[PDB]
Amino acid sequence: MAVIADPETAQGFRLAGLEGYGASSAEEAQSLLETLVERGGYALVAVDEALLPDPERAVERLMRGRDLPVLLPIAGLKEAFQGHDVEGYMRELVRKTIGFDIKL
């Protein structure tokens, strides 16, 4: 498939049969992901959280009406050693979804 991430992980994705690349900036990522989703022969692309937290702000304009390429934030190279705050993410999600901060 496709992943916009650090080229050192990109080769590992190639080992998993997944073409990947990156250049470590939000603007260039958003630039070439336009082509990537126009040349979107796959159904999902991954992007680290540090490039830009929300790919919706980027591809929402070009993916209009189309649903196949699902886009999600994925752990980065800093998280390769530290980890992630999973529950904070889920909670700020349900906050905007069902209107309030819950399950506390």
Added chain:
Amino acid sequence: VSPTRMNLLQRRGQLRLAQKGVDLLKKKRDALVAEFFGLVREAMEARKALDQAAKEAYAALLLAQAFDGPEVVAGAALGVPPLEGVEAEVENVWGSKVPRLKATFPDGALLSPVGTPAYTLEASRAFRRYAEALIRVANTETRLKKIGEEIKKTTRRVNALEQVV
């Protein structure tokens, strides 16, 4: 509206139906909230497993590029072809059809089944499981965001009725 006793009865019937529609929408939204919270737990669980699977693949790729040849890794990159058989099954979720991913993902019959690379040979195995965890996280979060959209839709409808109609 023409003022007649018959019209008064008809409008009163309309009011009764409006209220008995509001309460039904409310019950449906409650069911949706139950389903949504049932999903959020398994969603964060898949996120947990993905986090603990990313570290493994990351570490396997780490020493394989340094403590093995800094070039055998790129040779393995050029060696293996890409994967495209990611055809998705459209999936029903509460009156809507959403994509669900069934990437075929062949592993065994590809080129160079066994050979020379020392740490690369197994670091290529870790990114397989990394991709599986990715596809599970995607498959759960698409459904979660869909159910969320349905909930906000229904609450919009309830507010519309109870505040305008």
Added chain:
Amino acid sequence: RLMNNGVGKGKTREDHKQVSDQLYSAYANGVDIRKLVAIIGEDALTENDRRYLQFADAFERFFINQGQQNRSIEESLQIAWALLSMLPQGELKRISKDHIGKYYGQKLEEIWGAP
């Protein structure tokens, strides 16, 4: 409006009042669920809800629709208990435990075992 002053022990069988209230609550829930199951579908209902659905159905087919039969008060309370037996024990939160021990467990026998 006067019902409470004419039921109970010495006047009728003493479980009359609570059985009345319980039948009322169960039928109300059954009707609401019967409306919702048209837009949700039964497969997305919890288990107690399918219980209430089947209860409301059997209620209006055996309790209300009685034809020209002349039911005593005991036959009516029998049919009421045989219908309440569909819901799981413990759901009958209006009744007291004594009567539940005393009369629960019967199944629909008489209304189809007899005219």
Added chain:
Amino acid sequence: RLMNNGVGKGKTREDHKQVSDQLYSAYANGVDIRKLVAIIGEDALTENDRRYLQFADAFERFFINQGQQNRSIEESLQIAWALLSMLPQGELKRISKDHIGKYYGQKLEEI
């Protein structure tokens, strides 16, 4: 209806009329912003709508809610100017440009 005759230069302070109009207009759109956020998400927001919701709340809580105290016209006008001063210029497109500088300084800190 008879307000335009009784206020202004020589009768009250000079800025009275334009201050009143700008105050009305600023409170007007705060209410409709609150109406739209009420149904659609408050995610779809802009930088000045925050200013306007904040203005609407501080308005309802300081200008309208005066309790039992007796306020002279000067201090009512001062409170109004304080409430306006938390909206940037260009948002105050209704008041003339001289007292938009003459009175704009003081902010709500005085209570």
Added chain:
Amino acid sequence: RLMNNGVGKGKTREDHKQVSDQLYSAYANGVDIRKLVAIIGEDALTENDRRYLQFADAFERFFINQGQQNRSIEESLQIAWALLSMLPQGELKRISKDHIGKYYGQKLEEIWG
């Protein structure tokens, strides 16, 4: 009420009555679908529903709106058939098979552009 006394064979044309009430049915359907769109939005519609919506619209804008021109009855029936041809041939359930066979399929661009 007296419409049936003076239409049909030996008069205007044999398909007058059936064209008339088929138009009534299709237009009623269009109006009801408008009432539905007002609640569930235009995107949620099916395909035949959109065909009825389009029929109601084109009906109002070409058959009703003539504006001071004098149309003979044949022009009127011609326009009516051009408008009916938007619907699938299997949905004209108030017209017989032969009238369909020998009038269906005219296009509105031909009567005028």
Added chain:
Amino acid sequence: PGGDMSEPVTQSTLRIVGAFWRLDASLAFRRHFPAINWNGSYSLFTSALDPWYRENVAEDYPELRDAISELLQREAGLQEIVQLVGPDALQDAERLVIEVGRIIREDFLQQNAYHEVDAYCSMKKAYGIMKMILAFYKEAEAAIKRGVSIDEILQLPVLERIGRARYVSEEEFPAYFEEAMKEIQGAFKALA
């Protein structure tokens, strides 16, 4: 006066007559005749007339009539939800009831007063039409219980026979009905 069904003459008539046939404007606009409002009409003579029907029409005529009445009532009950959520949001088990109600309406109730053969309709003809509508509906419910989608059921071409049955002459009808019943049966047993 004014279409107002609450004026004194109408009310004074309600409390005397035996049957009550209520005409409504909405159906008359649609050019759908006789335009008898089903929800507002009644009759107090049915139960006393059932022996005559059993002996002169068919032994189960009352039960077919009752099943058609129950289906119309159930579809009327569903219309309330159809109004607030739209007809595509229902489950297939209820879209089926909506569709069979539409069929009952426009293929059995409706009648052409100027047609040469649909003007007068015998009572065994009405029996036959009711019988085949109910047979189709039962088979379609069974088929939905087996995963068949509601859309291809509406495309079954035996609906043409059912919707055309009322234009058949009174002497040509029995053969038509006997053909149509087995065609209905085959419309579902043959697909398997």
Added chain:
Amino acid sequence: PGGDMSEPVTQSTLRIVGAFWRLDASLAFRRHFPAINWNGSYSLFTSALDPWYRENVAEDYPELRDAISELLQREAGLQEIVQLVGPDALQDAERLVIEVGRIIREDFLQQNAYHEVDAYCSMKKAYGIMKMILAFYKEAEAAIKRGVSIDEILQLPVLERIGRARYVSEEEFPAYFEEAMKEIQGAFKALA
């Protein structure tokens, strides 16, 4: 006629009375007696009556009354979010206010007319109960702000005594009250 407060009799009355005590059946359905709705009810005599309260009950009686009213107001303005998700899904402060609202409306508002001691209550007895609850709530707020969970709090033994203060006689109430206040003070130290 049907519970509509817009008829002319009700409107004419509410303009000249000084208090409205809104009995409600939905409360007696869930076993709340007396079934006075504390949301629709009102009074207009409180401000005029404040001095007598200060001089005959306690110098702070009005502030405790307003505080209890405010707790009930907040707990009411919170119910919709409790209906949406349930009680367990809420925060610690929202859980605390839900619990203290339940304690108010189940140990202070509710009154048993047949109990030979709870049938009547003085003003000083009611003032004592209100003060007990406000003190407990202040302690609990400090605690959950500090880091205790609401669960240790719900199972505190002082609750079954603050909720049992209704059935104590009018003579044994001053002693019960002072020792219960000391106990409330004590259980907090264990939270400190």
